[PDB]
Swiss-Prot record:
Annotated GO CC locations: cytoplasm; endoplasmic reticulum; extracellular space
Domain C-type lysozyme, chain residue ranges per copy: 1-129
Family statement: Belongs to the glycosyl hydrolase 22 family.
Remarks, miscellaneous: Lysozyme C is capable of both hydrolysis and transglycosylation; it also shows a slight esterase activity. It acts rapidly on both peptide-substituted and unsubstituted peptidoglycan, and slowly on chitin oligosaccharides.
The name this protein goes by in its record: Lysozyme C
Alphabetical UniProt keywords: Allergen, Antimicrobial, Bacteriolytic enzyme, Disulfide bond, Glycosidase, Hydrolase, Secreted, Signal
Gene that produces this protein: LYZ
Active site: 35, 52
Catalytic activity: Hydrolysis of (1->4)-beta-linkages between N-acetylmuramic acid and N-acetyl-D-glucosamine residues in a peptidoglycan and between N-acetyl-D-glucosamine residues in chitodextrins
Annotated compartments: Secreted
Known partners and oligomeric status: Monomer.
Native species: Gallus gallus
KW S-adenosyl-L-methionine (keyword) present: no
Main location: secreted
Length: 129
């Protein structure tokens, strides 16, 4: 599924991400825009054998099991295919686990490069949340 910007903001709101571990809602919407262009089916296959899955491009080396990633752990306790659903719940529940892992949202390369430092409230303009 592809989300619209405000549609995704609403969905993330309802999953309690606003101010989750100190990160306002705009952060998460911005992250999703630049990681996956709002696409729940996005995949990116890397040179280390890992794959980034779903709307927040969660990586298979640490966080999910896809059966084909070298030296893999499964800290979200889920198959990676669960992150490819039109339902963002699994992605949100695993993202919560990741942002609490000590380096906040710098776990997302697109956030740290494209969102960090900017006025992220703009991502929820016009949404009427
Ligand atoms: Cl695996
Ligand atoms: Na894994």
């Amino acid at each position: 599924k592809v989300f619209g910007r405000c549609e995704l903001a609403a969905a993330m709101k309802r999953h309690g991400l606003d101010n989750y571990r100190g990160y306002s809602l705009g952060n998460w919407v911005c992250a999703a825009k630049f990681e996956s262009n709002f696409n729940t089916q996005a995949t990116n296959r890397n040179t280390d054998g890992s794959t980034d899955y779903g709307i927040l491009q969660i990586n298979s080396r640490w966080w999910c099991n896809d059966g084909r990633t070298p030296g893999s752990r499964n800290l979200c306790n889920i198959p990676c295919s669960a992150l490819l659903s039109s339902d963002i719940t699994a992605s949100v529940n695993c993202a919560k686990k990741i942002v609490s892992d000590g380096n906040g949202m710098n776990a997302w390369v697109a956030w740290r490069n494209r969102c960090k430092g900017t006025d992220v409230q703009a991502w929820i303009r016009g949404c009427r949340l």
